[PDB]
Design a protein around this ligand. Structure first.
Ligand SMILES: C=C1CN=c2nc(N)[nH]c(=O)c2=N1
Ligand SMILES: C=C1CN=c2nc(N)[nH]c(=O)c2=N1
Lengths: 271, 271
């Protein structure tokens, strides 16, 4: 199916043999504070996920709360750089950096990170694509927008995704460095979120690997009527349908559980 | 989609609004023994499953071990009848009887059970279809066979299923009383089991509701390489793909978990 491999510095990801699991490592400060406690705790969680079946570590320090502190750019670099340096040293796994800021990604790669995960799809700081250009890394372009005016959800999603790919390409990014994401949980009502799930397969005609990020999200809450810590089965279900719909990556909190489900789908869908 | 409802005595099952969960109640004696302990324990488990989201209780006393006792027909009636009588009295839910024996089903319905679940698809005791005829109950016809010679798995499965439907129809069973089951885990290698999963959708052209029974099965074990008590995620995955492939029933051990997954799929597939 894919006639190429995802090239990340010393690591090489195969897009055909199995659904690739991206482990979420949330590194967002809950107060102003680098210290051993945090970095150490991030490493052990990364190690856990590696043990549990993860193929990628997604380090993000921009989660949007509640309970998280507002962090300025130069502050996020000081916080997120040490995290990257230690994890990539003790956890032999490619790391993505979950940011939409250009100067953050720059420093994250320099500090040893391999993939950019942009939740704004180069739209917030188009500069980020140039950083993606230079260091020649894979960049994940997520569907997002600043409003919810959709004529036709899927058609508009695909349009926005292409506007992103354009910015990427014009800055220098090769096709083989581009991953797409429907941005489930972003600027979509619970109903649109469902629709986008139901119609994921359409993104495949763009010709890029697709990554899905639905782990624990509110729309699962809305359907199942369940708080964030009780959305494993919901998440599960989304991961299954996402894989049946042709996704190549899933970005999840429950690496152990999700990994077995991804494995069971791969067998069934014949991956 | 379905222009009718599944009619079970006092209960009425809608085949369009949600994937219907069948709770497994295993009532197979592990030694020669009716007594309060057993019947009481079966009731509390039935109640649990009702609380957990089950829409049907499948009482079977013919599970094939290891550790279960060989039980003669007149012995199984004495054991399984009390179970039925108590459960249907204290658990307001339709009950199916998991047998391929004709005289068992007869007595099970008489004792208050609403659906027949035949793992041999009327092939073992065609008489069973006449019992299904008389009491006018829904009967589940499972794919099964006494050998593994398949020219073409799906085509042969569909053929066998029709041979079953024929026996059913000739004995008197109405179309609206027929449910089909691919018999995952029966006379199928782990590879065929997967194939049958991957191609489930084909059974839909027969025009009957399809029930899926994959809970905890060995082929999940073989893929995931995990013992029977660690196949929740595997099972999950099968249930998801089964629903995406158009199933209307799932027959499972982990009612709580599976119910949330079924619920999340229904939302996504728009049921
Ligand atoms: C909550 C988040 C934060 N970052 C994400 N990044 C990607 N790529 N996809 C997501 O769904 C996602 N959700
Ligand atoms: C192990 C069992 C016992 N009875 C069953 N009955 C049905 N209908 N389907 C199954 O998959 C099944 N598995």
């Amino acid at each position: 199916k894919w006639d190429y491999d995802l090239r990340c510095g010393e690591y090489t990801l195969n897009l055909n043999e199995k659904t690739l699991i991206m482990g979420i490592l949330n590194v967002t400060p809950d107060s102003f504070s680098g210290s051993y406690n945090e970095v150490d705790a991030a490493v052990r969680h990364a190690k856990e996920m590696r043990d549990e079946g993860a193929h990628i570590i997604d380090i993000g320090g921009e989660s949007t709360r509640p309970g998280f502190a507002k962090v300025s750019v130069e502050e996020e670099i000081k916080r997120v750089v040490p995290m990257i340096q230690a994890v990539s040293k003790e956890v032999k796994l490619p790391i993505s950096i979950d940011t939409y800021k250009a100067e953050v990604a720059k420093q994250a790669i320099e500090a040893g990170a391999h993939i950019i995960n942009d939740i704004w799809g180069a739209k917030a700081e188009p500069k980020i694509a140039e950083v993606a250009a230079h260091y020649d890394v894979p960049i994940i372009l997520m569907h997002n927008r600043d409003n919810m005016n959709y004529r036709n959800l899927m058609a508009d999603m695909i349009a926005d995704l292409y506007d992103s790919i354009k910015i990427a390409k014009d800055a220098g990014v090769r096709d083989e460095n581009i991953i797409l994401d429907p941005g489930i949980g972003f600027a979509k009502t619970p109903e649109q979120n469902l629709e986008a799930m139901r119609n994921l397969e359409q993104l495949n005609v763009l010709g890029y690997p697709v990554l899905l990020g639905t782990s624990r999200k509110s729309f699962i809450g809305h359907v199942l009527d369940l708080p964030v810590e009780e959305r494993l089965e919901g998440t599960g279900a989304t991961v299954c349908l996402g894989i049946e719909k042709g996704c190549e990556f899933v970005r999840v909190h429950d690496v152990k559980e999700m990994s077995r489900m991804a494995k069971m789908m791969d067998a069934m869908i014949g991956k």
